[PDB]
């Protein structure tokens, strides 16, 4: 109890001359509260179950109708030395590792590379599950982006970025903003539940840090009444995530022309939104306008660094994209 009071220091989060007692829910006005963010976990569980239903009953028949391979991986040829190396040394040999294995086994590099690729495919999930997951991600990202566009088209802060800090902290909470924030937090918690359980043996790096940072930002911005600028970030970031899933779906059906086109479009949208628009527009409204209109708050040192972290992430992935696009030309 006392440690929670220490953590929620009103002189750290809220700006000068502002107390939590000012943001309590009164008769005529409703303000966002931390207690409203507990529904996110139940909604994430409901989303997880709906995802399971969609994958097994809606995506699998479509994959069957599109000649996706319904069987598992292939079987690697038997080899004692290769099996010992795969179980002991590593699972994804590099060029130097392939050369060393060829020297040790006195075998061609192509055969060892094919054997290790087959073993990796055995360890990797089948194409059917990846296709179903990509279809679910595409549908959810398209819904979220469309709802965000419909919500933002009427708001006064999309055109002028100095309207997110208009009457701070006295900005009432609307149904649309609450629904958008709860839906986003629920989706991120659903991704969490899916990753710590179903995929605890797949990936736990850049996308787990990305998820954690996104949940951190969404929660602490919602508690701090700094949510008008968060909708612009959520809608900007979800613009490009609806094309990568379509490109993956085109890839998994062995369509390379559509996959190449959709990936050139995803690359263009990703670069334009997350390298040209995001820093100049959102970090402008965040680093300088927020501190000018709202005043000196210390939470700014936490929030901008995190957004800069996100920007670093979204610059690494863009190098990864610029080379694939070079391969796609």
């Amino acid at each position, epitope marked *: 109890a006392g440690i929670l009071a220490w953590f929620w220091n009103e002189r750290f989060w809220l700006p000068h001359n502002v107390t939590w007692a000012d943001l309590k829910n*009164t008769e*005529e*006005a409703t303000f966002p509260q931390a207690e409203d963010l507990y529904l996110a976990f139940p909604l994430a569980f409901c989303i997880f179950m709906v995802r399971l239903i969609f994958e097994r009953f809606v995506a699998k028949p479509c994959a069957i109708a599109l000649n996706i391979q319904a069987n598992g991986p292939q079987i690697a040829p038997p080899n004692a030395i290769l099996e010992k190396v795969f179980t002991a040394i590593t699972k994804h040999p590099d060029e130097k590792r392939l050369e060393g294995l060829s020297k040790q086994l006195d075998w061609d590099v192509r055969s060892i590379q094919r054997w290790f690729r087959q073993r990796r495919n055995q360890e990797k999930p089948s194409t059917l599950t990846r296709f179903c997951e990509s279809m679910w991600r595409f549908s959810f990202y398209l819904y979220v982006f469309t709802y965000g566009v419909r919500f933002l088209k009427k*708001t*006064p802060w999309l055109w002028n970025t100095r*309207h997110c800090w*208009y*009457n701070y902290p*006295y*900005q*009432p909470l*609307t149904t649309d903003l609450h629904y958008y924030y709860i839906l986003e937090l629920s989706f991120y918690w659903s991704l969490m539940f899916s990753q710590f359980t179903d995929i605890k043996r797949k990936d736990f790096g850049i996308m787990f840090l990305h998820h954690l940072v996104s949940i951190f930002l969404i929660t602490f911005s919602y508690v701090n009444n700094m949510a008008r600028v968060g909708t612009l970030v959520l809608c900007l970031h979800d613009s490009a995530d609806a094309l990568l899933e379509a490109a993956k779906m085109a890839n998994y059906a062995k369509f390379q022309k559509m996959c190449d086109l959709l990936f050139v479009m995803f690359a263009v949208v990703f670069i334009t939104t997350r390298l040209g628009i995001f820093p100049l527009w959102v970090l402008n409204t965040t680093l300088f306008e927020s501190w000018e*209109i709202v005043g000196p708050y210390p939470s700014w040192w936490v929030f901008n660094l995190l957004l800069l972290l996100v920007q670093g992430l979204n610059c690494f992935w863009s190098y990864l994209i610029v080379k694939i696009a070079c391969k796609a030309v």
Partner: nanobody
Amino acid sequence: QLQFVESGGGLVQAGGSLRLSCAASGRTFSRYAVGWFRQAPGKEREFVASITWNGATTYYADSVKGRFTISRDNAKNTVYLQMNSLKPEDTAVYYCALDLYSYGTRDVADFGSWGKGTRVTVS
């Protein structure tokens, strides 16, 4: 409903200076942003000026800048619009309004809890 009552109006000679007051019978007038709107005869309501809860931002109309000033006193719960160098355009009925979702726009449909309205006459 914090129904406003605009007072402070009469007839002023041209090139004059007149102060107007809007009084709110409520306890939560200090959290809201308020605005002053005018309704020209045989015309629709226009946006004259607006002010936030703590006087941080004062938005004006492109026709009243400099000439018109808006201020508010939280303890008294009153808003004071000082008009200066009054031209004949100012002749209308002024209504004091309240902003409902802190949107910062220039619109008649975002402002509720309107008032009966005070009248100004400019020669």
